[PDB]
Design an enzyme around this catalytic site. Structure first.
Site, PDB file in Angstrom:
ATOM      1  N   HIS A  45       0.831  -1.230   0.000  1.00 57.09           N
ATOM      2  CA  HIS A  45       0.000   0.000   0.000  1.00 57.09           C
ATOM      3  C   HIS A  45       0.847   1.254   0.000  1.00 57.09           C
ATOM      4  O   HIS A  45       0.363   2.323  -0.409  1.00 57.09           O
ATOM      5  CB  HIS A  45      -1.017  -0.073   1.144  1.00 57.09           C
ATOM      6  CG  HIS A  45      -0.602   0.435   2.489  1.00 57.09           C
ATOM      7  ND1 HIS A  45      -0.385  -0.464   3.520  1.00 57.09           N
ATOM      8  CD2 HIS A  45      -0.401   1.658   3.009  1.00 57.09           C
ATOM      9  CE1 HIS A  45      -0.037   0.196   4.617  1.00 57.09           C
ATOM     10  NE2 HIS A  45      -0.036   1.488   4.331  1.00 57.09           N
ATOM     11  N   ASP A  93      -0.061  -7.487   1.746  1.00 51.75           N
ATOM     12  CA  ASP A  93       0.407  -6.103   1.811  1.00 51.75           C
ATOM     13  C   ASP A  93       1.936  -6.109   1.980  1.00 51.75           C
ATOM     14  O   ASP A  93       2.531  -5.915   3.039  1.00 51.75           O
ATOM     15  CB  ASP A  93      -0.219  -5.317   2.944  1.00 51.75           C
ATOM     16  CG  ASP A  93      -0.056  -3.805   2.790  1.00 51.75           C
ATOM     17  OD1 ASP A  93       0.563  -3.361   1.791  1.00 51.75           O
ATOM     18  OD2 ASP A  93      -0.543  -3.108   3.718  1.00 51.75           O
ATOM     19  N   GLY A 186       2.306   6.301   8.533  1.00 57.88           N
ATOM     20  CA  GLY A 186       3.712   6.613   8.323  1.00 57.88           C
ATOM     21  C   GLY A 186       4.649   5.515   8.884  1.00 57.88           C
ATOM     22  O   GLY A 186       5.823   5.541   8.527  1.00 57.88           O
ATOM     23  N   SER A 188       3.697   2.396   8.271  1.00 60.37           N
ATOM     24  CA  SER A 188       3.397   1.352   7.304  1.00 60.37           C
ATOM     25  C   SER A 188       4.660   0.990   6.517  1.00 60.37           C
ATOM     26  O   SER A 188       5.496   1.844   6.229  1.00 60.37           O
ATOM     27  CB  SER A 188       2.380   1.791   6.243  1.00 60.37           C
ATOM     28  OG  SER A 188       1.182   2.175   6.908  1.00 60.37           O
ATOM     29  N   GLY A 189       4.743  -0.318   6.230  1.00 58.47           N
ATOM     30  CA  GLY A 189       5.898  -0.732   5.431  1.00 58.47           C
ATOM     31  C   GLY A 189       7.091  -1.107   6.306  1.00 58.47           C
ATOM     32  O   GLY A 189       7.977  -1.871   5.896  1.00 58.47           O
TER      33      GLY A 189
HETATM   34 BR   LIG Z   1       0.601   4.678   6.288  1.00 62.14          BR
HETATM   35 BR   LIG Z   2       1.822   9.826   7.084  1.00 63.23          BR
HETATM   36 XE   LIG Z   3      -0.488   2.003  10.003  1.00 61.88          XE
END
Ligand SMILES: [Br-]
Ligand SMILES: [Br-]
Ligand SMILES: [Xe]
Ligand SMILES: [Br-]
Ligand SMILES: [Br-]
Ligand SMILES: [Br-]
Ligand SMILES: [Br-]
Ligand SMILES: [Br-]
Ligand SMILES: [Br-]
Ligand SMILES: [Br-]
Ligand SMILES: [Br-]
Ligand SMILES: [Br-]
Ligand SMILES: [Br-]
Ligand SMILES: [Br-]
Ligand SMILES: [Br-]
Ligand SMILES: [Br-]
Ligand SMILES: [Br-]
Ligand SMILES: [Br-]
Ligand SMILES: [Br-]
Ligand SMILES: [Br-]
Ligand SMILES: [Br-]
Ligand SMILES: [Br-]
Ligand SMILES: [Br-]
Ligand SMILES: [Br-]
Ligand SMILES: [Br-]
Ligand SMILES: [Br-]
Ligand SMILES: [Br-]
Ligand SMILES: [Br-]
Ligand SMILES: [Br-]
Ligand SMILES: [Br-]
Ligand SMILES: [Br-]
Ligand SMILES: [Br-]
Ligand SMILES: [Br-]
Ligand code: NA
Length: 240
Positions: A45, A93, A186, A188-189
């Site tokens: 994502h 994901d 932020g 994420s990943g």
């Molecule tokens: Br995010």
């Molecule tokens: Br963000």
């Molecule tokens: Xe998240």
């Protein structure tokens, strides 16, 4: 990261910042894990938007010169072929990013170690999430890399009604949910680091939190389970 503490500069050297070009500047948008000197593991994502992306390794403070950063462009993006941006609950994901250059390793830049394929952590196994994500629901990115202690919540509990119900899959790891500490946008990943026989491994790729908020009791942060994707990762790296 909500309810985190500032990470020591050299504690999590495989953590990267994934940034997109915005005018004459760069903006952090996601985390990632360096897994080869020219490959980063992140969330699919995070690269849904077709932006110019760069990876920063050896990053600690997004707003200041740390003296340790290497800035490298993203050359190729390989998203998991089953990923569907409008169905994050289905999982998948995860994405790999081939870097334009191979980074140089040092105490601030190391490869993340991945779990053995099919490994599932016992409930309440201790882990740390790391990231520069929001430090409050609807807040702002952290300046300095944060860590928070989030123990796992196993599939049986995490997929129970009080928790995430059917949204969570066995291809995900749940961690946290105490109402105080969590991942947030932020993050994420980026990685979920968990100890196994004395060594941290990156068991999770941060994927999502509750629409309700980041730190919501019994809405633990949800991560792609890395150990469900070892063969996929090896396959991409081998062909590319
Ligand atoms: Br995010
Ligand atoms: Br963000
Ligand atoms: Xe998240
Ligand atoms: Br690390
Ligand atoms: Br732009
Ligand atoms: Br900038
Ligand atoms: Br930024
Ligand atoms: Br390597
Ligand atoms: Br290399
Ligand atoms: Br700093
Ligand atoms: Br600032
Ligand atoms: Br700077
Ligand atoms: Br570059
Ligand atoms: Br591409
Ligand atoms: Br792709
Ligand atoms: Br090196
Ligand atoms: Br070193
Ligand atoms: Br050091
Ligand atoms: Br393992
Ligand atoms: Br393995
Ligand atoms: Br598996
Ligand atoms: Br797990
Ligand atoms: Br901060
Ligand atoms: Br329940
Ligand atoms: Br679902
Ligand atoms: Br599954
Ligand atoms: Br699975
Ligand atoms: Br042990
Ligand atoms: Br241990
Ligand atoms: Br509750
Ligand atoms: Br696998
Ligand atoms: Br394999
Ligand atoms: Br395969
Ligand atoms: Na910096």
């Amino acid at each position: 990261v909500v309810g985190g503490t500032e990470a020591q500069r050299n504690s999590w050297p495989s953590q990267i910042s994934l940034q997109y070009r915005s005018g004459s500047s760069w903006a952090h948008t996601c985390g990632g894990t360096l897994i080869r000197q020219n490959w980063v593991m992140t969330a699919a994502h995070c690269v849904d938007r077709e932006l110019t992306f760069r990876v920063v390794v050896g990053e600690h403070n997004l707003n200041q010169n740390d003296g340790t950063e290497q800035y490298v462009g993203v050359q190729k993006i390989v998203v998991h072929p089953y990923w569907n941006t409008d169905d994050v609950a289905a999982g998948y994901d995860i994405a790999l990013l081939r870097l334009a250059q191979s980074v140089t390793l040092n105490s601030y830049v190391q490869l993340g170690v991945l779990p053995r394929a099919g490994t599932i952590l016992a409930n309440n196994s201790p882990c740390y999430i790391t990231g520069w994500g929001l430090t409050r629901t609807n807040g702002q990115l952290a300046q300095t890399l944060q860590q928070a202690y989030l123990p796992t919540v196993d599939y049986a509990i995490c997929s129970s009604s009080s928790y995430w119900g059917s949204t969570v899959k066995n291809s995900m790891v749940c961690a946290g949910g105490d109402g105080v500490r969590s991942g947030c946008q932020g993050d994420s990943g980026g990685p979920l680091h968990c100890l196994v026989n004395g060594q941290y491994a990156v068991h999770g790729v941060t994927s999502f939190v509750s629409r309700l908020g980041c730190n919501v009791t019994r809405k633990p942060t949800v991560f792609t389970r890395v150990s469900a994707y070892i063969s996929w990762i090896n396959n991409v790296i081998a062909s590319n």
